[PDB]
Amino acid sequence: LAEALHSAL
């Protein structure tokens, strides 16, 4: 989650 969310935004 941390990584995916960081890149998504």
Side-chain angles (χ1 to χ4, degrees):
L1 174 59
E3 179 172 12
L5 181 65
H6 183 239
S7 296
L9 297 180

